[PDB]
Amino acid sequence: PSRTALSPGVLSPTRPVPNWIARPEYVGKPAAQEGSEPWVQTPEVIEKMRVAGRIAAGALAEAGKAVAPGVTTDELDRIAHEYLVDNGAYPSTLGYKGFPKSCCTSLNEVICHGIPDSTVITDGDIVNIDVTAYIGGVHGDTNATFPAGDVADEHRLLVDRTREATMRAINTVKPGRALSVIGRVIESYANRFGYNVVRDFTGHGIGTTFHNGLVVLHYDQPAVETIMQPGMTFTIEPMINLGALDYEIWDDGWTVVTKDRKWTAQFEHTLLVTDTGVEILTCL
Ligand SMILES: CO[C@@H](C(=O)NCC(N)=O)[C@H](O)[C@@H](O)[C@H](O)/C=C/C(C)(C)C
Ligand SMILES: [Mn+2]
Ligand SMILES: [Mn+2]
Numbered sequence: 001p002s003r004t005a006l007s008p009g010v011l012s013p014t015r016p017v018p019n020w021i022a023r024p025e026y027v028g029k030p031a032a033q034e035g036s037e038p039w040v041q042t043p044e045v046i047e048k049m050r051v052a053g054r055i056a057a058g059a060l061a062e063a064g065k066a067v068a069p070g071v072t073t074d075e076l077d078r079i080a081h082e083y084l085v086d087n088g089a090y091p092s093t094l095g096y097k098g099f100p101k102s103c104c105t106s107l108n109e110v111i112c113h114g115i116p117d118s119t120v121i122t123d124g125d126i127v128n129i130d131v132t133a134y135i136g137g138v139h140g141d142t143n144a145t146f147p148a149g150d151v152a153d154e155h156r157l158l159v160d161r162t163r164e165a166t167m168r169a170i171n172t173v174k175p176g177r178a179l180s181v182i183g184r185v186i187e188s189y190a191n192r193f194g195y196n197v198v199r200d201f202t203g204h205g206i207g208t209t210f211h212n213g214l215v216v217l218h219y220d221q222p223a224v225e226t227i228m229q230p231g232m233t234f235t236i237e238p239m240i241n242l243g244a245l246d247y248e249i250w251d252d253g254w255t256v257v258t259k260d261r262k263w264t265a266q267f268e269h270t271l272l273v274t275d276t277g278v279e280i281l282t283c284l
Contacts, residue, residue, distance in 0.1 A: 123149030
């Protein structure tokens with residue numbers, strides 16, 4: 001047996017960031033200045049995005065190595081926070097629209113945007129950790145779902161097939177292809193197993209802003225006319241549900257849970273379209 005439905009816990013105090021680490025503009029504001037930026041980046045921005053992506057990937061991998069029964073989601077956030085700050089990076093989630101932590105931790109039926117707290121991971125859980133770094137005036141965003149202890153076959157397979165969907169989508173990225181191929185590939189692959197691909201949450205362009213106004217759908221919708229071009233940078237971050245797509249948001253305003261409490265899995269990378277194909281910016 002796996003655990004039953006989650007409830008929110010208590011947050012630790014806000015984690016500080018040394019003042020020499022520049023903040024994104026939206027920290028200490030209610031909204032963010034984003035959504036109207038160009039989608040193709042300049043070579044100088046891309047170079048800085050490789051640095052931000054590698055730091056985010058290191059923070060994700062170090063917090064993922066900690067995932068085990070008995071560990072809290074707050075302890076994962078401490079590891080991610082300290083990794084970013086030791087690397088001179090600001091955690092992009094911290095203070096975005098008042099989000100109180102440095103990464104998102106989404107167990108089990110939480111589709112996304114779970115808030116690190118006193119929740120104890122236990123055997124059988126699947127734990128998504130989502131970390132974004134802001135350094136050099138740019139962002140790098142990545143996430144992965146990690147098993148804790150011996151995960152039930154249905155849940156294990158959900159995670160492994162969501163990772164495979166994500167990688168198949170990434171491997172479609174090439175200049176001249178329609179962006180809509182990403183969602184066509186993910187949803188065709190997920191529908192082999194009877195899973196439902198989340199529609200209301202999406203990938204996005206990313207650069208000097210976190211969510212730059214480019215939207216990447218993870219379901220099939222061939223009427224989008226956007227083409228991938230060299231220098232475009234965006235995330236692929238599909239959420240895939242065992243159950244229905246209906247969802248609820250907790251009173252914290254962030255945590256999104258499936259209404260049927262069936263589990264859900266996600267993986268994410270920040271990608272660059274190159275002249276011949278794709279480059280994963282959020283790799284070690
Ligand atoms: C699904 O989540 C993505 C997203 O909201 N996409 C756009 C959308 N409207 O669906 C998001 O970019 C995550 O990858 C990111 O790590 C988290 C950021 C905050 C919690 C600070 C917002
Ligand atoms: Mn993310
Ligand atoms: Mn993202």
